[PDB]
Amino acid sequence: MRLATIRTNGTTIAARVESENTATTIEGFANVGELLQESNWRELAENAAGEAVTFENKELDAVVPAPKKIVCVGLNYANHIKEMGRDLPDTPTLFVKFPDALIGPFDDVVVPEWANKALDWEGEMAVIIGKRARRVKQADAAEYIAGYAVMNDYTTRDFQYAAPAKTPQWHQGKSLEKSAGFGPWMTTPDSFEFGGELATYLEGEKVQSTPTNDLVFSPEKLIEYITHIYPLDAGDVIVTGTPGGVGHARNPQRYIGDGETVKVEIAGLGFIENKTVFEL
Amino acid sequence: MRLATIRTNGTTIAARVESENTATTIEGFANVGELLQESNWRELAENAAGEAVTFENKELDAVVPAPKKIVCVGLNYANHIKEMGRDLPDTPTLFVKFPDALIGPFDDVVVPEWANKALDWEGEMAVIIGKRARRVKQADAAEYIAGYAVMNDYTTRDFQYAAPAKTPQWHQGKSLEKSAGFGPWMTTPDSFEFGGELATYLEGEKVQSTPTNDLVFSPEKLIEYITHIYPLDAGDVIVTGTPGGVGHARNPQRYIGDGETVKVEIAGLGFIENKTVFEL
């Protein structure tokens, strides 16, 4: 099953995706995040009786536009980490993205002048939580996954490495408002298999590539690890990390310019495509 | 003016504090955070006409129990930074504490077994935002401050420095569920003068001390810096950092043990006092 947040009538709805450009409104919910607060969200999605909508890509909102928590992982692709010639981490790197960073899967990223110097892509899988997860064991954690989507962990590298200089806290380079494409829709775990390619394109050229089943920390492990620190609620998001090929590490070093488009695709989930636009 | 969130059996109220243990109910609101969503919150508080109440310390809740954002600063006391032989930072260090971490100003910090090996104090001032702040200039920033309070940025140092080893992200050490006392109440800026001592006590012995007017980054500077990355909503919290004398830095290294009490006091704002209790 595929769940979207779609802009219609100057507001938003939660919708069951029926094809690439058709959906059925799920009445009573402004977005997928509100729908996931109901324990019977699957039943409600299966009985979608609201307006039939035919939608353009740019009418898709961020699939979960107002999660309470977006917990982002650092290194997590085993083969990527080994190509770098270092050990597999035994502890997850975690940092926070505020929900204000989220945009529609096809929205322009509009960047103010103070933030436009070192813009970089990070194509990633998002795991969306299905019910309140506190102190969950890895063996039970799949039960807490509503579904999967795609995100660009869109980065301002100069802010990311600013402070403190020896051990910079990445948060301020990872939470630029209206930066992170998120969608195109959530796919439930019965309708997705890991193993497909996650790929990022800059201006149509492939800059990232990895199989999705090469994780160091599985979504289940990340749920166990995180939820022994603080709970995850229904509608919260774990972003499971990016492989190699980020612009910051390329030779020559490559950042996103004015007018340039980053596409992130996960075979089985769909894709997002956000054009960077420098503010007026 | 001083505003508190007070637990009253099965209900909770926003209240204007009248003395150390009496307040006036501000009718229509469960807590100070809800109250601040109202544009005329200041008039509603000044004209509080609800029931007079008497409260015990342990009946105070986190003054703002559900902020959308708690943005935490690193090093921010100039004389502390200079005495460590460091240059003053040009850029604020920023990391996130989830509001799940908040407890009442006299609440016990109940710590699970896997989190109890390196518990540490960080006595800090909190800045509470009083209206939506987006791209605010430092000269305008004081209009966006509802008031000040006291927070313990209660730390699990083993988690804080875990991942990645060379440049650890602190967040996972800074957001333990129900760890950070917050209050005792919010004092409006017209009722507060910077310059008084911020002090932390472990079992009644002073472990941290600074004048409150020795910041590298003022509340106004932090509002300007943060709101050019993402907005701050009414009820959101900036924690402006801690001085020296943390247990991790001491020789020998002293961590909080079972039954030990950390008191954080700011002259002009009041104090919080939280006893660490290892669970079960």
> Closest by alpha carbon to B270, among B191, B206, B180, B208?
B191
Q: Which of B229, B239, B242 to mutate to test the interface with A (most CBs of A within 10 A)?
A: B229
Contact assignment for A163 to B101 by CB distance below 8 Å: no
Q: Which of A90, A171, A227 to mutate to test the interface with B (most CBs of B within 10 A)?
A: A171
List of residues 6+ apart from B267 with CB closer than 8 A: B196, B197, B198, B212
d(CA A66, CA A14): 13
- Residue ranges of alpha helices (H) inside A91-176 are 138-141, 157-160
d(CA B30, CA B7): 9
List of residues 6+ apart from B202 with CB closer than 8 A: B121, B247, B254, B256, B260, B261, B262
Give me the residue from A98, A159, A168 closest to B69, CB to CB. A98
Q: Which residues of B touch A168 (CB under 8 A)?
A: 167
- One-character DSSP codes across A205-245: EEEEEEETT-BSS-HHHHHHHHHTTS-B-TT-EEE----S-
How distant is the Cα of A158 from the closest Cα of chain B, in angstroms?
11
Contact A214, A25 (CB under 8 A): no
Q: Which of A102, A166, A172 to mutate to test the interface with B (most CBs of B within 10 A)?
A: A172
Give me the residue from B94, B168, B229 closest to A167, CB to CB. B168
d(CA B261, CA B106): 10
> Closest by alpha carbon to A223, among A147, A134, A161, A158?
A134
d(CA A4, CA A211): 25
d(CA B18, CA A89): 54
Q: Which residues of B touch A172 (CB under 8 A)?
A: 92, 94, 229
Give me the residue from A112, A114, A171 closest to B94, CB to CB. A171
d(CA A239, CA A146): 14
> Which two three-digit tokens encode residue B238?
């900036």
Q: Is A32 helix (H, G, I), strand (E, B) or coil?
A: helix
CA distances from A17 to A14, A53, A86, A189 (A): 10, 9, 42, 15
Q: What is the DSSP letter of B217?
A: S
> Closest by alpha carbon to B265, among B216, B218, B207?
B207
Half-sphere exposure of A235 (CA within 13 A, CB side): 22
Q: Say how many C-beta atoms besides its own lie within 10 A of residue A130's C-beta.
A: 23
Report whether the peptide linkage leading into residue B184 is cis, meaning its omega lies within 30 degrees of zero: yes
The approach used to solve this structure was: X-ray
Query: Beta strand pairing status for B237-239 and B70-73?
Result: parallel
d(CA B8, CA B52): 12
**A200: phi then psi, degrees, rounded to nearest 5:** -115, 140
Stated length of chain A: 280
Show me where the domains of chain B are located: 1-63, 64-280
Interface A–B counts its CB contacts (< 8 A) at: 96
- Residue B29 sits at the vertex; the CA angle it makes with B25 and B32, to the nearest 5 degrees, is 85
Q: Is A142 helix (H, G, I), strand (E, B) or coil?
A: helix
Report whether the peptide linkage leading into residue B164 is cis, meaning its omega lies within 30 degrees of zero: yes
> Closest by alpha carbon to A179, among A160, A199, A151, A159?
A151
Declared resolution, Å: 2.0
Residue type, B147: G
> Closest by alpha carbon to B191, among B268, B271, B270?
B268
Q: Is B1 helix (H, G, I), strand (E, B) or coil?
A: coil
Contact A97, A124 (CB under 8 A): no
d(CA B126, CA B149): 5
- One-character DSSP codes across B25-93: EETT-SSHHHHHTSTTHHHHHHT--S-EEE--GGGBPPSSSS-S-EEEESB-BHHHHHHTTPPPPSS--
Which stretch of DSSP H or E encloses residue B202? strand B197-202
Contact assignment for A169 to B228 by CB distance below 8 Å: no
Return the residue matching tokens 């009414």.
B234
Nearest CA in chain A to B92: A163
> Which two three-digit tokens encode residue B109?
């910090």
Contact B245, B263 (CB under 8 A): no
Sign, Cα dihedral of A137, A140, A145, A146: negative
Contact assignment for A91 to B162 by CB distance below 8 Å: yes
d(CA B13, CA B29): 6
Percent helix, strand and coil across chain A, each to the nearest 5: 20, 35, 45
Contact assignment for A96 to B96 by CB distance below 8 Å: yes
d(CA A21, CA A18): 8
Contact assignment for A172 to B231 by CB distance below 8 Å: no
> Which two three-digit tokens encode residue A155?
């980065």
Nearest CA in chain A to B233: A100
How distant is the Cα of B212 from the closest Cα of chain A, in angstroms?
22
- Considering all CA atoms of chain B, what is the largest pairwise distance in Å, rounded to the nearest integer? 56
List of residues 6+ apart from A140 with CB closer than 8 A: none
> Closest by alpha carbon to A101, among A139, A153, A58?
A153
Residue type, A174: K
Q: Where are the beta strands (DSSP E) in chain A?
A: 2-8, 11-19, 22-26, 52-54, 70-73, 94-96, 102-103, 109-111, 119-120, 123-129, 145-152, 155-156, 180-187, 197-202, 205-211, 237-239, 261-266, 270-278
> Closest by alpha carbon to A212, among A196, A201, A191?
A196
Burial string for B33-50 (b: 16+ CB within 10 Å, else e) reads bbbbeeeebbebbeebeb
d(CA A255, CA A241): 19
Q: Is A202 helix (H, G, I), strand (E, B) or coil?
A: strand
Give me the residue from A100, A171, A230 closest to B95, CB to CB. A171
CATH code of the domain made up of A64-280:
3.90.850.10
